[PDB]
Coordinates of C-alpha atoms and ligand atoms in Angstrom, one line a residue:
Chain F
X3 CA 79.8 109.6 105.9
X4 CA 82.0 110.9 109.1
X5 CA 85.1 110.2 109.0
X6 CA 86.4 108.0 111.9
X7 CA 89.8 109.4 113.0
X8 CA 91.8 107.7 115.2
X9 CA 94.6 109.1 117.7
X10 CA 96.5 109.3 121.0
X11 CA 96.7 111.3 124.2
X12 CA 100.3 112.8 123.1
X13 CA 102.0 116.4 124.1
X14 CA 101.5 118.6 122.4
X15 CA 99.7 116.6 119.3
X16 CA 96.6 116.0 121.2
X17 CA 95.9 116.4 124.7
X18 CA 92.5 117.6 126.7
X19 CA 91.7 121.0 127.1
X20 CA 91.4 123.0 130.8
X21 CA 87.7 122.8 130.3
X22 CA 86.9 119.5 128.5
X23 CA 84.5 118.3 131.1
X24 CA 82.0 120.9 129.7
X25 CA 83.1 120.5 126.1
X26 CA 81.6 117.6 123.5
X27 CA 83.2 115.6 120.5
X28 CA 85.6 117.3 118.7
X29 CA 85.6 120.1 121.0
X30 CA 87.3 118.4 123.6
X31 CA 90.5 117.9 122.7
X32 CA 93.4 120.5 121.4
X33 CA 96.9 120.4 119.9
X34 CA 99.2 120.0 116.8
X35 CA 97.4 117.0 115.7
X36 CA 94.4 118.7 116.8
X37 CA 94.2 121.5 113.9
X38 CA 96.2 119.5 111.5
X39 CA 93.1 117.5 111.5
X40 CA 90.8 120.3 111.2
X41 CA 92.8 121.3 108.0
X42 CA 93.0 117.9 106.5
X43 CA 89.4 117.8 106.4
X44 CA 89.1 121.4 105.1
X45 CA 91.3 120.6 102.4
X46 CA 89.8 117.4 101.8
X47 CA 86.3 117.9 102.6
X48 CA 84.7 115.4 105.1
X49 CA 83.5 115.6 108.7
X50 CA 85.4 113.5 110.9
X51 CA 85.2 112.1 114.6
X52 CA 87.9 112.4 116.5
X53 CA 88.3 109.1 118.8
X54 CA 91.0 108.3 121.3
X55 CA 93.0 104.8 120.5
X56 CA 91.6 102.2 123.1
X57 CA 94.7 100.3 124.3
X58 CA 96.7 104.0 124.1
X59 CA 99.7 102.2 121.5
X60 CA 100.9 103.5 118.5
X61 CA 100.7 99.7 117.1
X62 CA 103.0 96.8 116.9
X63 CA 102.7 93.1 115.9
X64 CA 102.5 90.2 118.5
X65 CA 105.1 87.8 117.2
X66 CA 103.1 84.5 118.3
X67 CA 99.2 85.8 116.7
X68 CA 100.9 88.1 114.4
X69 CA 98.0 90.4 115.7
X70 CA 98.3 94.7 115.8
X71 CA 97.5 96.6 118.0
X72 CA 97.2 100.4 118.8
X73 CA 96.2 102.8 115.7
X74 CA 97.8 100.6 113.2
X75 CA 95.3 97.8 114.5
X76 CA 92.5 100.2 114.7
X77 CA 93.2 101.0 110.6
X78 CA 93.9 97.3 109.7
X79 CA 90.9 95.6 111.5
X80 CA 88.6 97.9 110.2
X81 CA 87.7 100.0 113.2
X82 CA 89.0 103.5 112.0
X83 CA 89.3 105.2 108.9
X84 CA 92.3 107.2 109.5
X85 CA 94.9 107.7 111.8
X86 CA 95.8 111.3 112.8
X87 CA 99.1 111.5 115.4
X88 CA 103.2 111.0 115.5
X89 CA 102.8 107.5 113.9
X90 CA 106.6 106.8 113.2
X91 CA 106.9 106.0 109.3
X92 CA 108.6 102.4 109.3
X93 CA 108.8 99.5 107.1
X94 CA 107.1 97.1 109.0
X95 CA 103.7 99.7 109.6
X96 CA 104.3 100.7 105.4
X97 CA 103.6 97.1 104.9
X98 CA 100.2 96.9 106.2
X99 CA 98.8 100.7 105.8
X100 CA 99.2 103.5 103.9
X101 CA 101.0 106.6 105.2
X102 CA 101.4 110.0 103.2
X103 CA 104.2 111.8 102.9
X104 CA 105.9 113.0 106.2
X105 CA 104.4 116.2 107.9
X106 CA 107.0 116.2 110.5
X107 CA 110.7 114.6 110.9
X108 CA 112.6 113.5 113.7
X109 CA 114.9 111.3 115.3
X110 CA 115.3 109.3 118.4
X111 CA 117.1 111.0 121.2
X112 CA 118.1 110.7 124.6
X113 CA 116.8 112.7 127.6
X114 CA 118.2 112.8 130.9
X115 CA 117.4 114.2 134.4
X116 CA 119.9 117.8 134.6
X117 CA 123.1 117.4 135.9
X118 CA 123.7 113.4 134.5
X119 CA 126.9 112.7 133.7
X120 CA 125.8 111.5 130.0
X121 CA 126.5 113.3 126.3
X122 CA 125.8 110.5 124.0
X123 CA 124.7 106.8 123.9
X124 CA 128.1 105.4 123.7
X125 CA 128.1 106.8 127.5
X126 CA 125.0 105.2 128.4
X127 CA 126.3 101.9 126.2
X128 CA 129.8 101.4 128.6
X129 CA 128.1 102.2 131.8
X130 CA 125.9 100.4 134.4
X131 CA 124.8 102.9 137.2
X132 CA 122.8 105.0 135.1
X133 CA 119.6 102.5 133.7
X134 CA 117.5 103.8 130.6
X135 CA 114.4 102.4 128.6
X136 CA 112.1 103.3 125.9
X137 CA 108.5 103.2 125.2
X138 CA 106.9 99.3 124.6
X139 CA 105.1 98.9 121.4
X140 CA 106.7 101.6 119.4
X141 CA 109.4 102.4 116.3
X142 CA 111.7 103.0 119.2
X143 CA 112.1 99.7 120.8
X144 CA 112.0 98.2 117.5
X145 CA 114.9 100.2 116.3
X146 CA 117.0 99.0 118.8
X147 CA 115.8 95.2 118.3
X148 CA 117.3 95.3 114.9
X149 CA 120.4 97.4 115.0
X150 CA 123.6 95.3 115.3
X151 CA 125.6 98.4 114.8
X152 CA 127.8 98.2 118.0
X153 CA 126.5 101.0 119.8
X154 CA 123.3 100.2 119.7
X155 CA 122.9 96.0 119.9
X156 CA 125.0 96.4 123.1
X157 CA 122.2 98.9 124.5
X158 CA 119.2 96.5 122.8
X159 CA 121.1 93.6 124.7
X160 CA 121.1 95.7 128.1
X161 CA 117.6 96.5 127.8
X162 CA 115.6 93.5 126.7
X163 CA 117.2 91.6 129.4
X164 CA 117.2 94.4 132.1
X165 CA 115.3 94.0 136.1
X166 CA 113.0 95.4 136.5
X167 CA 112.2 96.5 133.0
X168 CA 113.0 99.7 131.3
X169 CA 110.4 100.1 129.6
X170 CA 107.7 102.1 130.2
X171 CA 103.3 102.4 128.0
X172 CA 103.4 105.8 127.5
X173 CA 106.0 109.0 127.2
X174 CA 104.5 110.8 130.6
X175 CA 105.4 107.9 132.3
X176 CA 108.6 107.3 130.6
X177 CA 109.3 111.3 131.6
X178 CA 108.1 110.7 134.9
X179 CA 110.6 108.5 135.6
X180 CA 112.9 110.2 134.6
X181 CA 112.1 113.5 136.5
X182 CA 111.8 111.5 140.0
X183 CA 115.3 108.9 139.6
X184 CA 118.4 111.3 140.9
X185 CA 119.6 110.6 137.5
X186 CA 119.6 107.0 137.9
X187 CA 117.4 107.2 134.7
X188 CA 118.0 108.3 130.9
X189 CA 115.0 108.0 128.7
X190 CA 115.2 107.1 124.7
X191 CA 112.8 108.5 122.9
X192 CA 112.1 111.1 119.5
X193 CA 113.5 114.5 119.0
X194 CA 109.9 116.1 119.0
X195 CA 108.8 115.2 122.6
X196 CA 111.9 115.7 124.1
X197 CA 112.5 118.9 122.8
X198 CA 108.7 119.8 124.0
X199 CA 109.2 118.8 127.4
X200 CA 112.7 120.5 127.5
X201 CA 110.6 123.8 127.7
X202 CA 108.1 123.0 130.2
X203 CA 108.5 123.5 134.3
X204 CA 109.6 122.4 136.4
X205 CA 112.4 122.9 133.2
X206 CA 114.5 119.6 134.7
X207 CA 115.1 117.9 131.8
X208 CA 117.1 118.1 128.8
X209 CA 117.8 116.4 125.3
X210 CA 121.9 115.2 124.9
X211 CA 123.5 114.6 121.9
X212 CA 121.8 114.2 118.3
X213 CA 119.5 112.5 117.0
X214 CA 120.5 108.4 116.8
X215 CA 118.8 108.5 113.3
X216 CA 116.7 110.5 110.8
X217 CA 112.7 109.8 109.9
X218 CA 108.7 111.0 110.1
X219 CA 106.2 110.9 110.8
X220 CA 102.5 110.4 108.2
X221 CA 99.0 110.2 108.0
X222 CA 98.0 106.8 107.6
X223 CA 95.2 104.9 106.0
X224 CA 93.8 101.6 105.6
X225 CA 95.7 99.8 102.8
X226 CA 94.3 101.0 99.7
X227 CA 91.9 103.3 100.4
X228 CA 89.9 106.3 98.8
X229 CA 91.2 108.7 101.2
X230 CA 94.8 108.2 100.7
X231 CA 95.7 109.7 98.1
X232 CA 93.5 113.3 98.7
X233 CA 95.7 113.1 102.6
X234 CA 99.0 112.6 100.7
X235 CA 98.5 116.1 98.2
X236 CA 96.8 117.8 101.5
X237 CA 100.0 117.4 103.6
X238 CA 102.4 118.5 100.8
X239 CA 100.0 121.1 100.2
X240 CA 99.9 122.3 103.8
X241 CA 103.9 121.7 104.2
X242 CA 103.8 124.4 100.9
X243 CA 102.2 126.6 102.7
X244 CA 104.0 127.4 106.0
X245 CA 100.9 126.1 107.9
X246 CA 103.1 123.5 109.3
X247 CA 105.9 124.9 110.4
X248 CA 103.3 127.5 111.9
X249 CA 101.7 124.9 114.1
X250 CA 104.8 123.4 115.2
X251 CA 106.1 127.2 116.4
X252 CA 102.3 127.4 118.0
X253 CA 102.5 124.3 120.1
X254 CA 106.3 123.9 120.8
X255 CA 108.1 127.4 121.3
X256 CA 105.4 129.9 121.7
X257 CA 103.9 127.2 124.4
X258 CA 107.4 127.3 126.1
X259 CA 107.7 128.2 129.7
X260 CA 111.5 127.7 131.0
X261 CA 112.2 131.6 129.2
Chain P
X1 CA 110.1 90.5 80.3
X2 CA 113.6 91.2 81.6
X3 CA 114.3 94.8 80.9
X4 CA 117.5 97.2 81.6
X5 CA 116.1 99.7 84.2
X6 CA 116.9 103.4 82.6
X7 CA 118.0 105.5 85.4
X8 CA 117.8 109.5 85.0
X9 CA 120.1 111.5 87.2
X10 CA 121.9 114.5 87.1
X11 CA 125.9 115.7 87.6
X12 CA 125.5 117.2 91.0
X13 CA 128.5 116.8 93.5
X14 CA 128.1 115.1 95.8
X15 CA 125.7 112.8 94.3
X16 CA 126.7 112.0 91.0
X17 CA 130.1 112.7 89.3
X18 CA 132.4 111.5 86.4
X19 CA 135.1 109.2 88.1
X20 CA 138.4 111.2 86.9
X21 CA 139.5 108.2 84.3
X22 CA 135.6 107.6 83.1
X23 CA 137.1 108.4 79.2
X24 CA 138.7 105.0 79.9
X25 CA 135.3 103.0 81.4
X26 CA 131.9 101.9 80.6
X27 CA 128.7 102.5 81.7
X28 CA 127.5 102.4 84.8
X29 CA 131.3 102.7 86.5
X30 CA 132.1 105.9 84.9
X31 CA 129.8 107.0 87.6
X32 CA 130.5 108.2 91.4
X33 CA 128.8 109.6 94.5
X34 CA 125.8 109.4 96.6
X35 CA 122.9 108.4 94.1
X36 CA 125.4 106.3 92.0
X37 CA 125.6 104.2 95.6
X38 CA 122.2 104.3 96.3
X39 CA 120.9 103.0 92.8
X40 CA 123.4 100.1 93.2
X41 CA 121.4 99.2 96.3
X42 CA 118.2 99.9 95.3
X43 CA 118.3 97.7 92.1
X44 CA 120.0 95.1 94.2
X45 CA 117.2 95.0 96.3
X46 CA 114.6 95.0 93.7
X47 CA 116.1 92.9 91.7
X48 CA 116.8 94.4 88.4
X49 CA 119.4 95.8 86.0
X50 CA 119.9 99.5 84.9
X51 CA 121.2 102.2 82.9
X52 CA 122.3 105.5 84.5
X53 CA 121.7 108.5 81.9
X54 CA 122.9 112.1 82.6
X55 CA 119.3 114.1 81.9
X56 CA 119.4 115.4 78.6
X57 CA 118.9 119.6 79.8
X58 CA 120.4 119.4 82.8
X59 CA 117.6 120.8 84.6
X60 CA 115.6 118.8 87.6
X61 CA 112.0 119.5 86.6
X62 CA 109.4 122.3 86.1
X63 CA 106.4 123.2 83.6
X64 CA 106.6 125.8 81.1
X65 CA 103.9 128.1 82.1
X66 CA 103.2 128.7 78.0
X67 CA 104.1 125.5 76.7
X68 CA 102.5 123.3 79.8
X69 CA 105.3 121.0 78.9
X70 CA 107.8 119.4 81.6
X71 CA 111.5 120.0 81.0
X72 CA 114.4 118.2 83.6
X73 CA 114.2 114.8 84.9
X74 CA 110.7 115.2 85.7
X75 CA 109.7 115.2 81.7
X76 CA 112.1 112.4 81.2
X77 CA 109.5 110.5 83.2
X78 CA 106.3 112.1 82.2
X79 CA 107.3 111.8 78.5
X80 CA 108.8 108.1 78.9
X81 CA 112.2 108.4 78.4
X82 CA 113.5 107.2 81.4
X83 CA 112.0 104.3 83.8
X84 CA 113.0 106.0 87.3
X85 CA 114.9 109.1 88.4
X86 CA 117.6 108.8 91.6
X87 CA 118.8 112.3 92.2
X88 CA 118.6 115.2 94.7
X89 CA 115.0 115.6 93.6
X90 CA 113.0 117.5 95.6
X91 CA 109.5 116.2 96.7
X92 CA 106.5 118.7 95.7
X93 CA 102.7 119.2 95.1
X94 CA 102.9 119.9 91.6
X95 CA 105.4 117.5 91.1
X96 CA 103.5 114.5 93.2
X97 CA 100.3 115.6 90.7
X98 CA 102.2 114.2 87.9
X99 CA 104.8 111.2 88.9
X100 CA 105.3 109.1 92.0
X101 CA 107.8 110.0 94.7
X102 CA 109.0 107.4 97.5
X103 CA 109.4 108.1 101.1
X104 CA 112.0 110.6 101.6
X105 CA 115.8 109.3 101.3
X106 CA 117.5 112.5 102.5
X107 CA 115.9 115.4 104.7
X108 CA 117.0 119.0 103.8
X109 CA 115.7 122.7 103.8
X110 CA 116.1 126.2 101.8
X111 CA 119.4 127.9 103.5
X112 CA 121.9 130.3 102.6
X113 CA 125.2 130.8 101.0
X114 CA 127.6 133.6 102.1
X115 CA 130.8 134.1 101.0
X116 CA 133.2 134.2 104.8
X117 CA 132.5 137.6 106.0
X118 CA 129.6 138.8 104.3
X119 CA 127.8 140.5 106.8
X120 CA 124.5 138.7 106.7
X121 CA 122.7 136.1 109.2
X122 CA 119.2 135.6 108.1
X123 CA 116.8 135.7 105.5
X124 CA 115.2 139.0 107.1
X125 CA 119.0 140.1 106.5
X126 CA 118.6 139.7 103.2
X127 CA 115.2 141.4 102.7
X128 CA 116.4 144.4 104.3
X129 CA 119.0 145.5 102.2
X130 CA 119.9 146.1 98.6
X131 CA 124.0 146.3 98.6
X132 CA 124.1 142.2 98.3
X133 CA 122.3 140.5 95.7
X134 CA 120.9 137.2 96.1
X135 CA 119.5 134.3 93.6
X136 CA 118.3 130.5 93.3
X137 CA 119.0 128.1 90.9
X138 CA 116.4 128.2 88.1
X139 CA 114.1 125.3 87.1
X140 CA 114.1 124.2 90.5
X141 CA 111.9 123.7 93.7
X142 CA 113.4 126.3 95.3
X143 CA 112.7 129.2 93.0
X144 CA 109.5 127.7 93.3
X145 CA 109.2 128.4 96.8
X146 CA 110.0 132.0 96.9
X147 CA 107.6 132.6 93.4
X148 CA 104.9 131.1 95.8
X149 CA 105.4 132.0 99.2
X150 CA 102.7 133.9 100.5
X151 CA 105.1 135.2 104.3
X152 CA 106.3 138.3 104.4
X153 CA 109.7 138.1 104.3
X154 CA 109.5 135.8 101.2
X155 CA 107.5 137.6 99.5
X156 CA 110.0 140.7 99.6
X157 CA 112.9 138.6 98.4
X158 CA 111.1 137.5 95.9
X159 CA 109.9 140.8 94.4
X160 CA 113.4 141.8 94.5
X161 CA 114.8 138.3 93.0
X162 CA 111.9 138.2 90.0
X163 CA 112.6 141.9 88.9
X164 CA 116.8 142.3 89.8
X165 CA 119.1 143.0 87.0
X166 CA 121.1 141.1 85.6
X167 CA 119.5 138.6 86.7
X168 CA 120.3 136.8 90.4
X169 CA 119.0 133.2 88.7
X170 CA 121.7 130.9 87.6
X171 CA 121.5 127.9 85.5
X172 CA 123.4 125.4 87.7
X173 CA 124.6 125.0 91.4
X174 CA 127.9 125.2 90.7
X175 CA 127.4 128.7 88.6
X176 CA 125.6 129.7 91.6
X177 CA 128.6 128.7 94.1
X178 CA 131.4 130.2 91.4
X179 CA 129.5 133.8 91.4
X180 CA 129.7 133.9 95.2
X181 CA 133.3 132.9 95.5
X182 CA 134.2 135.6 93.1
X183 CA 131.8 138.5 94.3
X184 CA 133.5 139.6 97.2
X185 CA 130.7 139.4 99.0
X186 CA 128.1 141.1 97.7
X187 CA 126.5 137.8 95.9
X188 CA 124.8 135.8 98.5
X189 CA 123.2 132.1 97.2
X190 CA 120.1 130.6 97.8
X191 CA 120.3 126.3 97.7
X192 CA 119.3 123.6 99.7
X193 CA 121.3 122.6 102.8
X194 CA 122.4 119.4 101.8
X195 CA 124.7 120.9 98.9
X196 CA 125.5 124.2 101.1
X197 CA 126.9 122.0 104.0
X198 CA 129.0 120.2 101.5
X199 CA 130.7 122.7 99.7
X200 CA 131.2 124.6 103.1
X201 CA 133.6 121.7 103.3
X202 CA 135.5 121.8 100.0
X203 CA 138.6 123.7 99.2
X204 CA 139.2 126.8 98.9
X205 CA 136.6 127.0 102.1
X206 CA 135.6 130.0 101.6
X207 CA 132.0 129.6 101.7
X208 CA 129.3 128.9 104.6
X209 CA 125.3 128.2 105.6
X210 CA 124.3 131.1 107.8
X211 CA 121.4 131.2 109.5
X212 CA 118.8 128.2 110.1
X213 CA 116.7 126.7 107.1
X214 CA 113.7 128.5 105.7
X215 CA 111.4 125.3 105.2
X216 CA 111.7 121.5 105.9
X217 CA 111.3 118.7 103.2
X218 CA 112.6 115.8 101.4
X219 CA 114.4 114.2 98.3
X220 CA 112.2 111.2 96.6
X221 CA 113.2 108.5 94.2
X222 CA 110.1 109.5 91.2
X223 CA 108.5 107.0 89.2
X224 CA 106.0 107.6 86.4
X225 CA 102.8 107.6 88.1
X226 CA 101.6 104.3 87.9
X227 CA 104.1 102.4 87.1
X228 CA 105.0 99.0 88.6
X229 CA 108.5 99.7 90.4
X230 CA 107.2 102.5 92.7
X231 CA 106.1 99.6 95.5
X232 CA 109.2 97.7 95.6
X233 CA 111.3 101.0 95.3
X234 CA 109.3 102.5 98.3
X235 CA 109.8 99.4 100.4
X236 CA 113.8 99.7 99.4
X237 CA 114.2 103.1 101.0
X238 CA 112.3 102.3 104.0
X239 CA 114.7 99.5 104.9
X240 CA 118.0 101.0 103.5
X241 CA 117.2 103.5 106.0
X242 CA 116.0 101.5 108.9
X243 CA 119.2 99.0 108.3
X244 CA 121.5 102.4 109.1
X245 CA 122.7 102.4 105.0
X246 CA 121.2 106.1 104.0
X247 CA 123.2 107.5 107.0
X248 CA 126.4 105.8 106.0
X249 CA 126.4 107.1 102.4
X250 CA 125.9 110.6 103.9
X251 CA 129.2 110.4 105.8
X252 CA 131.3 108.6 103.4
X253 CA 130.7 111.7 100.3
X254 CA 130.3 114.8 102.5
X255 CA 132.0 114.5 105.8
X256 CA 134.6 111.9 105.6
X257 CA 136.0 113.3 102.6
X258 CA 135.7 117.2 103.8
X259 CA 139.1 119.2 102.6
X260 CA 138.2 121.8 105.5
X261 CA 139.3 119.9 108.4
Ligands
HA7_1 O1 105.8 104.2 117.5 C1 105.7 105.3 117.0 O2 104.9 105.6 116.1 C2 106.8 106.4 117.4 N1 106.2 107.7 117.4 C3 105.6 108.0 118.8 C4 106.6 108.1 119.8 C5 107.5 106.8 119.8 C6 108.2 106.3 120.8 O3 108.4 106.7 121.9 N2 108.8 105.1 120.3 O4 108.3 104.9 119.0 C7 107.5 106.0 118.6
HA7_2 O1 114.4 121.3 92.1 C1 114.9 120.4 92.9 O2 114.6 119.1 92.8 C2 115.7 120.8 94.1 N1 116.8 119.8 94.4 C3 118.0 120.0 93.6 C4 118.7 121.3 94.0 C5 117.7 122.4 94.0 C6 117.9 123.8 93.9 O3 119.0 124.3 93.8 N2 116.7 124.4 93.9 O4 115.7 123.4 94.0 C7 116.3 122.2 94.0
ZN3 ZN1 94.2 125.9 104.9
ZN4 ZN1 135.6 114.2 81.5
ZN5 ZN1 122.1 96.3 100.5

C-alpha cells in the first residue's frame, strides 16, 4: 500500500517548483521536507503520495466540538497516514498522535521590518505604536495563551484582544505584512522561517533577539501505528548521518541571496 | 503495587553533585543540581516515589564490541537494575534499539574545549595540525560520533584520535577538563556544549567553546523498553517544558551561579 503523506505549502520545507505545471505527483513539489520524505521512505521502504493539507493549518482543537484540524486532523480522522512538515512537537498534538524524535529544533522568534526600533519582546510588551501577531491555529499562538510569565501574558493579553486582529493563516502572509507596514508591524514566529527569509531579497527583514523558548519539530503518525516506530529509528538514523544538517545547509544558506 | 522508583544517574556538574555536608544527610537530599531538580518534578508529576543511585561504573552507556554486553546507565536499565535513568544522556540509534528515550529535555551539540589562547577555531583546525592533541570522553556518544562519522574532516580526527599515543581518551569529563587546564595549550577537549558552556564559567576561567557545534541533538530520560512509566514520563517533559520549568533550571545551575562574571 502507498503511503499517504500529508503536508503544507511552507519555505523552504515544501514549496512548488518553477515548472510544476508540467510536472505530476510527487514530482511537483521540492524542498527540505521534500527529500526528507524521499529518505524516510528509502530507509523505511514504502511508496508514498505526497498530498497538500486541505484547510493549509498545522492543526489545533476547536474548544466548543473539540474537533482538529490541519495535519493533526488529517492523521486523527483517518485521512492520512503520515505527516511530513515543521509540525511543532507539543503536548497537546503528543496527546493525540505520535511524533518521532525531533529532526530539527527551534524556537519562537521575533522578526521585524529593518530599521524598527525593537531588540526583544519586553520592547514590543511596554509599547503600543508598533502592533505584532502570530500565525492562528498553531504552537505559537498557543504558547502565548498559556504563558503567565510576565512578559509574555501581557503580550497574549495585547493580542487576543487586539483591532483589527494580529493574526494572520499562513507565514507568507504574516511576512507580507510585515514587509509592507513602515515598521508598524513585528511578526512572532519560529527561528527556522525567520532565519530563511532573513536571506532572501528584497533582504528587508531581520530576526531580533533569541529565541523566546527551545523545541522541534517530528514526524508524526496516527496514534499507535505500524509506521511509527520504523520513522522514529529512520530520523535518528538520518540525524547520525549528517544528512540532516546537509539538507538544512542545502535549503537555508546555500539558497541564500542577500550575500 | 506501590514501588520506590530506582533512579540511575551519574556525578556530573552541573547535573548531579554531593551537597558539601551529604556525610551528614540521607538519601535523596545528599543530592544537588539540574537532574536532582528535574527528577523531583518528574516524580511529582507522575506520581511516584524514588531512589537516586550513583551508576555503579560511572560510565553513561556503550556495548562491548566482544562481550555484546551494555556497561553505564544504559545496562543498568537493560540488565534491570534500575527503573529509569535522569542524566545528561545522550539520545542515539543504537541506544533507542535497546531502551526508551523521552522527548528531548535539553538540546546540545559536539563542541570544543581550548584552553584561553590556544590557537585553534574549528574542527578543520584541529584536523590540520599535529602540535595539539585532542580527545573525547570514552564510553560515550560522542566518541561514538567521531568512530562513525563518515565527513571528511571527522574522519581525519578520528584516525588521529583512535591511533594517538598515549592515549587522547579520558575516563571522565572532569579528567578531560583537568588535562587541558594543565597542558598549556597543547590539549584541546572534545564534550558536549552544555558541560563546555558551564565550565567556561567556573573559576579559574581559563577555559572556552570555540567554534560552532559539530552536530545537533538531545538528552532523554530512558526507560527500559517497554516498560510502563515511559508514557507518563514523556507527557512530564513535554509540559515541564511548555510551562517555562526546563528553561528555569538551566539558568539557576549554569548562568546564575557563573564565578566568571
Ligand atoms: O504549529 C506548528 O506546528 C508550528 N510550526 C509551524 C510554524 C508555526 C507557527 O508559525 N506557529 O506555530 C507553528
Ligand atoms: O554518552 C552520553 O550520553 C553523552 N552525554 C554525557 C556527556 C558525553 C560525552 O562527554 N561524550 O558523550 C556524552
Ligand atoms: Zn540515505
Ligand atoms: Zn564527600
Ligand atoms: Zn511542577
Amino acid at each position: 500500500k502507498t503511503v499517504v503523506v500529508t503536508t503544507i505549502l511552507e519555505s523552504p520545507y515544501v514549496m512548488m517548483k518553477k515548472n510544476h505545471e508540467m510536472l505530476e505527483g510527487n514530482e511537483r513539489y521540492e524542498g527540505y521536507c521534500v527529500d526528507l520524505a524521499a529518505e524516510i521512505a528509502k530507509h523505511c521502504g514504502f511508496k508514498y503520495k505526497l498530498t497538500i493539507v486541505g484547510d493549509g493549518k498545522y492543526g489545533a482543537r476547536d474548544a466548543d466540538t473539540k474537533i482538529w484540524n490541519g495535519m493533526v486532523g488529517e492523521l486523527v480522522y483517518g485521512k492520512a497516514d503520515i505527516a511530513i512538515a515543521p509540525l511543532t512537537i507539543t503536548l497537546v498534538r503528543e496527546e493525540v498522535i505520535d511524533f518521532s524524535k525531533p529532526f530539527m529544533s527551534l524556537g519562537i522568534s521575533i522578526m521585524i521590518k529593518k530599521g524598527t526600533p525593537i531588540e526583544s519582546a519586553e520592547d514590543l510588551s511596554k509599547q503600543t505604536e508598533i502592533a505584532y501577531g502570530t500565525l492562528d491555529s498553531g504552537s505559537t499562538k498557543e504558547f502565548f495563551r498559556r504563558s503567565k510569565i510576565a512578559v509574555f501574558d501581557k503580550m497574549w493579553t495585547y493580542m487576543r484582544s487586539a483591532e483589527p486582529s494580529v493574526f494572520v493563516r499562513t507565514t507568507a502572509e504574516g511576512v507580507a505584512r510585515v514587509r509592507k507596514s513602515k515598521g508598524k508591524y513585528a511578526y512572532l514566529l519560529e527561528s527556522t522561517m525567520n532565519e530563511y527569509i532573513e536571506q532572501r531579497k528584497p533582504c528587508d527583514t531581520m530576526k531580533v533577539g533569541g529565541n523566546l523558548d527551545s523545541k522541534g519539530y517530528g514526524i508524526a503518525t496516527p496514534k499507535g501505528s505500524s509506521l511509527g516506530n520504523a520513522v522514529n529509528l529512520a530520523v535518528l538514523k538520518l540525524n547520525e548521518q549528517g544528512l540532516l544538517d546537509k539538507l538544512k545547509n542545502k535549503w537555508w544558506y546555500d539558497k541564500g541571496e542577500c550575500g
